[PDB]
Design a protein around this ligand. Structure first.
Ligand SMILES: OC[C@H]1CNC[C@@H](O)[C@@H]1O[C@@H]1O[C@H](CO)[C@@H](O)[C@H](O)[C@H]1O
Length: 300
Protein backbone atom coordinates (compact mmCIF):
# COMPACT_ATOMS: atom_id res chain seq x y z
CA UNK A 1 0.00 0.00 0.00
CA UNK A 2 2.71 2.60 0.92
CA UNK A 3 4.76 2.40 -2.27
CA UNK A 4 1.69 2.04 -4.47
CA UNK A 5 0.19 5.18 -2.89
CA UNK A 6 3.25 7.40 -2.83
CA UNK A 7 5.11 5.85 -5.76
CA UNK A 8 8.17 7.63 -7.10
CA UNK A 9 9.86 9.75 -4.46
CA UNK A 10 11.72 12.91 -5.34
CA UNK A 11 13.09 16.12 -3.82
CA UNK A 12 11.16 19.35 -4.41
CA UNK A 13 12.32 22.59 -2.80
CA UNK A 14 14.41 20.70 -0.28
CA UNK A 15 11.61 18.33 0.79
CA UNK A 16 10.93 14.66 0.24
CA UNK A 17 7.74 14.39 -1.81
CA UNK A 18 5.69 11.69 -3.47
CA UNK A 19 4.83 11.37 -7.14
CA UNK A 20 1.99 13.95 -6.74
CA UNK A 21 4.39 16.47 -5.17
CA UNK A 22 3.01 16.07 -1.66
CA UNK A 23 5.32 15.90 1.36
CA UNK A 24 5.87 12.41 2.74
CA UNK A 25 7.68 11.28 5.85
CA UNK A 26 9.22 7.82 6.11
CA UNK A 27 9.67 6.22 9.55
CA UNK A 28 11.23 2.82 10.09
CA UNK A 29 13.99 0.60 11.40
CA UNK A 30 17.57 -0.07 10.54
CA UNK A 31 19.14 -3.47 10.85
CA UNK A 32 22.29 -3.74 12.90
CA UNK A 33 25.31 -4.96 10.97
CA UNK A 34 24.22 -7.59 8.48
CA UNK A 35 27.39 -9.59 9.16
CA UNK A 36 26.39 -10.00 12.82
CA UNK A 37 22.57 -9.85 13.08
CA UNK A 38 21.36 -10.73 9.61
CA UNK A 39 18.94 -13.31 10.93
CA UNK A 40 16.60 -10.45 11.91
CA UNK A 41 16.35 -9.32 8.26
CA UNK A 42 13.82 -11.41 6.37
CA UNK A 43 10.41 -11.12 4.80
CA UNK A 44 8.59 -12.30 7.93
CA UNK A 45 10.26 -9.90 10.35
CA UNK A 46 9.85 -7.03 7.90
CA UNK A 47 6.19 -7.90 7.44
CA UNK A 48 5.70 -7.89 11.23
CA UNK A 49 7.39 -4.49 11.43
CA UNK A 50 5.14 -3.21 8.66
CA UNK A 51 1.91 -4.56 10.15
CA UNK A 52 2.49 -4.29 13.91
CA UNK A 53 4.83 -1.27 14.09
CA UNK A 54 3.65 0.59 10.99
CA UNK A 55 7.08 0.97 9.33
CA UNK A 56 7.20 2.32 5.80
CA UNK A 57 10.96 2.05 5.26
CA UNK A 58 13.66 -0.45 6.24
CA UNK A 59 17.41 0.24 6.25
CA UNK A 60 19.82 -2.58 5.39
CA UNK A 61 23.07 -1.66 7.18
CA UNK A 62 25.82 -3.39 5.22
CA UNK A 63 29.06 -2.69 7.06
CA UNK A 64 31.99 -2.51 4.70
CA UNK A 65 34.67 -3.22 7.30
CA UNK A 66 34.37 -4.94 10.72
CA UNK A 67 33.78 -8.31 9.07
CA UNK A 68 31.40 -6.84 6.52
CA UNK A 69 31.34 -6.70 2.77
CA UNK A 70 35.03 -6.07 2.07
CA UNK A 71 35.99 -9.06 4.30
CA UNK A 72 33.15 -11.33 3.18
CA UNK A 73 31.05 -10.08 0.28
CA UNK A 74 28.34 -12.69 0.77
CA UNK A 75 26.50 -10.14 2.89
CA UNK A 76 25.43 -8.36 -0.33
CA UNK A 77 22.96 -11.21 -0.80
CA UNK A 78 21.29 -10.31 2.47
CA UNK A 79 20.90 -6.74 1.16
CA UNK A 80 19.22 -8.24 -1.93
CA UNK A 81 16.91 -10.30 0.34
CA UNK A 82 15.94 -7.12 2.20
CA UNK A 83 15.28 -5.17 -0.99
CA UNK A 84 13.16 -7.97 -2.42
CA UNK A 85 11.18 -8.20 0.83
CA UNK A 86 10.52 -4.45 0.73
CA UNK A 87 9.33 -4.75 -2.87
CA UNK A 88 7.02 -7.65 -1.90
CA UNK A 89 5.76 -5.73 1.17
CA UNK A 90 5.31 -2.43 -0.68
CA UNK A 91 7.62 -0.41 1.56
CA UNK A 92 10.72 1.66 0.86
CA UNK A 93 14.24 0.32 1.45
CA UNK A 94 17.59 1.97 2.10
CA UNK A 95 20.70 0.24 0.78
CA UNK A 96 23.40 1.45 3.23
CA UNK A 97 27.11 1.23 2.36
CA UNK A 98 27.89 1.33 6.05
CA UNK A 99 31.34 2.84 6.46
CA UNK A 100 32.58 3.51 9.99
CA UNK A 101 36.10 2.40 10.95
CA UNK A 102 36.96 2.82 7.28
CA UNK A 103 36.35 6.47 8.03
CA UNK A 104 37.05 7.99 4.62
CA UNK A 105 34.59 6.82 1.94
CA UNK A 106 37.41 6.94 -0.60
CA UNK A 107 39.15 3.94 1.05
CA UNK A 108 36.77 1.47 -0.60
CA UNK A 109 35.47 3.70 -3.41
CA UNK A 110 36.29 1.19 -6.18
CA UNK A 111 34.30 -1.49 -4.41
CA UNK A 112 31.49 0.99 -3.70
CA UNK A 113 31.20 1.90 -7.36
CA UNK A 114 30.98 -1.75 -8.33
CA UNK A 115 28.46 -2.52 -5.57
CA UNK A 116 26.19 0.41 -6.44
CA UNK A 117 26.47 -0.44 -10.17
CA UNK A 118 25.20 -3.94 -9.37
CA UNK A 119 22.41 -2.80 -7.05
CA UNK A 120 21.14 -0.04 -9.33
CA UNK A 121 21.23 -2.39 -12.34
CA UNK A 122 19.13 -4.94 -10.43
CA UNK A 123 16.71 -2.62 -8.71
CA UNK A 124 16.82 0.69 -10.55
CA UNK A 125 13.35 0.27 -12.10
CA UNK A 126 11.62 -0.03 -8.74
CA UNK A 127 10.53 3.11 -6.79
CA UNK A 128 11.26 1.43 -3.45
CA UNK A 129 15.02 1.88 -3.43
CA UNK A 130 16.98 4.63 -1.70
CA UNK A 131 20.78 4.49 -1.95
CA UNK A 132 22.86 5.50 1.09
CA UNK A 133 26.36 5.70 -0.31
CA UNK A 134 28.45 6.37 2.84
CA UNK A 135 26.93 5.90 6.32
CA UNK A 136 29.32 7.96 8.58
CA UNK A 137 32.37 9.67 7.18
CA UNK A 138 34.44 10.68 10.20
CA UNK A 139 37.81 12.06 11.27
CA UNK A 140 39.32 15.53 11.09
CA UNK A 141 41.05 14.49 7.85
CA UNK A 142 37.73 13.71 6.13
CA UNK A 143 35.93 16.84 5.01
CA UNK A 144 32.97 17.51 2.81
CA UNK A 145 34.82 19.49 0.19
CA UNK A 146 37.99 17.43 0.05
CA UNK A 147 36.79 13.84 0.58
CA UNK A 148 33.05 13.30 0.75
CA UNK A 149 31.70 15.47 -2.06
CA UNK A 150 34.24 14.17 -4.63
CA UNK A 151 33.47 10.58 -3.54
CA UNK A 152 29.76 11.25 -4.11
CA UNK A 153 30.58 12.79 -7.52
CA UNK A 154 32.17 9.43 -8.54
CA UNK A 155 29.47 7.13 -7.14
CA UNK A 156 26.36 9.10 -8.10
CA UNK A 157 27.10 8.91 -11.89
CA UNK A 158 27.45 5.11 -11.60
CA UNK A 159 23.98 4.91 -10.01
CA UNK A 160 22.47 7.47 -12.38
CA UNK A 161 23.55 5.50 -15.44
CA UNK A 162 21.13 2.77 -14.25
CA UNK A 163 18.61 4.67 -12.10
CA UNK A 164 18.13 8.31 -13.10
CA UNK A 165 16.20 9.65 -10.16
CA UNK A 166 15.65 7.41 -7.08
CA UNK A 167 16.80 9.15 -3.91
CA UNK A 168 20.50 9.09 -2.93
CA UNK A 169 21.46 9.86 0.69
CA UNK A 170 25.02 11.16 1.11
CA UNK A 171 26.79 11.02 4.46
CA UNK A 172 28.30 14.10 6.01
CA UNK A 173 31.39 14.81 8.10
CA UNK A 174 31.85 14.11 11.80
CA UNK A 175 29.77 10.88 11.74
CA UNK A 176 27.07 12.44 9.55
CA UNK A 177 26.57 15.47 11.76
CA UNK A 178 28.18 18.22 9.66
CA UNK A 179 25.21 19.18 7.55
CA UNK A 180 26.27 22.83 7.71
CA UNK A 181 29.24 22.35 5.42
CA UNK A 182 27.31 20.13 3.01
CA UNK A 183 24.44 22.60 2.82
CA UNK A 184 26.89 25.38 1.90
CA UNK A 185 28.44 23.30 -0.91
CA UNK A 186 25.65 21.15 -2.27
CA UNK A 187 25.85 18.42 -4.91
CA UNK A 188 24.31 19.00 -8.32
CA UNK A 189 21.93 16.02 -8.46
CA UNK A 190 18.37 17.13 -7.76
CA UNK A 191 17.36 13.93 -5.94
CA UNK A 192 20.04 13.95 -3.26
CA UNK A 193 19.62 14.23 0.46
CA UNK A 194 22.27 14.65 3.15
CA UNK A 195 22.42 12.29 6.10
CA UNK A 196 22.08 13.55 9.65
CA UNK A 197 22.50 11.13 12.56
CA UNK A 198 21.81 11.73 16.25
CA UNK A 199 21.83 9.86 19.53
CA UNK A 200 19.55 11.01 22.33
CA UNK A 201 22.26 10.70 24.99
CA UNK A 202 23.80 13.87 23.52
CA UNK A 203 22.18 17.16 24.48
CA UNK A 204 20.71 18.13 21.08
CA UNK A 205 19.65 21.78 21.02
CA UNK A 206 22.49 23.11 18.86
CA UNK A 207 22.34 20.04 16.59
CA UNK A 208 18.65 20.84 15.93
CA UNK A 209 19.63 24.43 15.13
CA UNK A 210 22.28 23.17 12.67
CA UNK A 211 19.73 20.94 10.92
CA UNK A 212 17.51 24.04 10.60
CA UNK A 213 20.45 25.99 9.13
CA UNK A 214 20.93 23.27 6.51
CA UNK A 215 17.24 23.17 5.67
CA UNK A 216 17.32 26.96 5.26
CA UNK A 217 19.93 26.54 2.49
CA UNK A 218 17.49 24.39 0.56
CA UNK A 219 19.35 21.10 1.39
CA UNK A 220 17.16 18.05 1.96
CA UNK A 221 18.00 16.01 5.08
CA UNK A 222 17.23 12.37 5.82
CA UNK A 223 17.83 11.17 9.41
CA UNK A 224 19.02 7.81 8.12
CA UNK A 225 20.12 6.66 11.57
CA UNK A 226 19.29 7.72 15.11
CA UNK A 227 19.18 6.07 18.51
CA UNK A 228 17.67 6.46 21.95
CA UNK A 229 21.02 5.67 23.55
CA UNK A 230 24.32 7.45 23.90
CA UNK A 231 26.46 7.84 20.75
CA UNK A 232 28.13 4.47 21.36
CA UNK A 233 24.83 2.64 20.86
CA UNK A 234 24.81 1.89 24.61
CA UNK A 235 25.03 3.90 27.84
CA UNK A 236 21.41 4.13 28.83
CA UNK A 237 18.20 5.19 27.21
CA UNK A 238 17.30 8.91 26.91
CA UNK A 239 13.61 9.02 26.07
CA UNK A 240 13.03 12.63 27.07
CA UNK A 241 15.56 13.91 24.55
CA UNK A 242 14.42 11.29 22.01
CA UNK A 243 10.91 12.70 22.20
CA UNK A 244 12.22 16.24 21.61
CA UNK A 245 13.91 14.96 18.46
CA UNK A 246 10.81 13.03 17.36
CA UNK A 247 8.71 16.19 17.61
CA UNK A 248 11.38 18.25 15.81
CA UNK A 249 11.50 15.74 12.94
CA UNK A 250 7.70 15.77 12.60
CA UNK A 251 7.62 19.58 12.47
CA UNK A 252 10.34 19.58 9.79
CA UNK A 253 9.09 16.66 7.55
CA UNK A 254 12.22 14.69 8.31
CA UNK A 255 12.22 10.98 7.48
CA UNK A 256 14.07 8.62 9.79
CA UNK A 257 15.33 5.11 10.57
CA UNK A 258 16.07 3.95 14.12
CA UNK A 259 19.17 1.99 15.17
CA UNK A 260 18.63 -0.93 15.52
CA UNK A 261 16.78 -4.19 15.05
CA UNK A 262 18.75 -6.67 17.14
CA UNK A 263 18.75 -8.43 20.50
CA UNK A 264 22.29 -7.31 21.32
CA UNK A 265 22.76 -6.29 24.94
CA UNK A 266 23.08 -2.56 24.33
CA UNK A 267 20.51 0.12 25.06
CA UNK A 268 19.83 1.10 21.44
CA UNK A 269 18.85 -2.46 20.51
CA UNK A 270 15.08 -2.78 19.94
CA UNK A 271 14.70 -6.44 20.97
CA UNK A 272 15.34 -8.55 24.06
CA UNK A 273 17.27 -11.87 23.97
CA UNK A 274 14.35 -14.26 23.32
CA UNK A 275 12.83 -12.28 20.40
CA UNK A 276 12.07 -14.49 17.42
CA UNK A 277 14.08 -13.45 14.33
CA UNK A 278 10.93 -13.85 12.20
CA UNK A 279 8.78 -11.40 14.19
CA UNK A 280 5.67 -11.74 16.35
CA UNK A 281 7.20 -10.10 19.40
CA UNK A 282 5.30 -9.64 22.66
CA UNK A 283 5.72 -6.51 24.75
CA UNK A 284 8.20 -8.35 26.98
CA UNK A 285 10.38 -9.15 23.97
CA UNK A 286 10.85 -5.46 23.13
CA UNK A 287 13.50 -3.47 24.96
CA UNK A 288 12.74 -0.09 26.49
CA UNK A 289 14.12 1.47 23.29
CA UNK A 290 12.06 -0.83 21.05
CA UNK A 291 8.85 -0.17 22.95
CA UNK A 292 9.31 3.58 22.54
CA UNK A 293 10.21 3.43 18.85
CA UNK A 294 7.28 1.12 18.08
CA UNK A 295 4.97 3.59 19.85
CA UNK A 296 6.35 6.48 17.87
CA UNK A 297 5.75 4.72 14.55
CA UNK A 298 2.28 3.43 15.54
CA UNK A 299 1.24 6.98 16.68
CA UNK A 300 2.24 8.29 13.32
O1 LIG B 1 27.58 3.92 17.93
C1 LIG B 1 26.21 3.68 17.56
C2 LIG B 1 26.09 3.61 16.04
C3 LIG B 1 26.47 4.95 15.43
N1 LIG B 1 26.23 4.92 13.97
C4 LIG B 1 26.97 3.82 13.29
C5 LIG B 1 26.61 2.47 13.88
O2 LIG B 1 27.39 1.52 13.21
C6 LIG B 1 26.87 2.50 15.40
O3 LIG B 1 26.47 1.24 15.91
C7 LIG B 1 27.39 0.64 16.82
O4 LIG B 1 28.52 0.23 16.10
C8 LIG B 1 29.48 -0.37 16.96
C9 LIG B 1 30.72 -0.57 16.14
O5 LIG B 1 30.41 -1.36 14.98
C10 LIG B 1 28.87 -1.66 17.54
O6 LIG B 1 29.84 -2.29 18.38
C11 LIG B 1 27.62 -1.34 18.30
O7 LIG B 1 27.00 -2.57 18.73
C12 LIG B 1 26.63 -0.55 17.43
O8 LIG B 1 25.51 -0.12 18.16
Amino acid sequence: SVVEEHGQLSISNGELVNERGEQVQLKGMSSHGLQWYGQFVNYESMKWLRDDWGINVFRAAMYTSSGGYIDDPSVKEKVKEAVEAAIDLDIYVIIDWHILSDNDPNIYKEEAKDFFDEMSELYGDYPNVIYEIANEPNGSDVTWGNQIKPYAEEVIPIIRNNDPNNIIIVGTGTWSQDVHHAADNQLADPNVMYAFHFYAGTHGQNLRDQVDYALDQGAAIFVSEWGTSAATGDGGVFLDEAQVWIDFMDERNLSWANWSLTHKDESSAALMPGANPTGGWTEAELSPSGTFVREKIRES
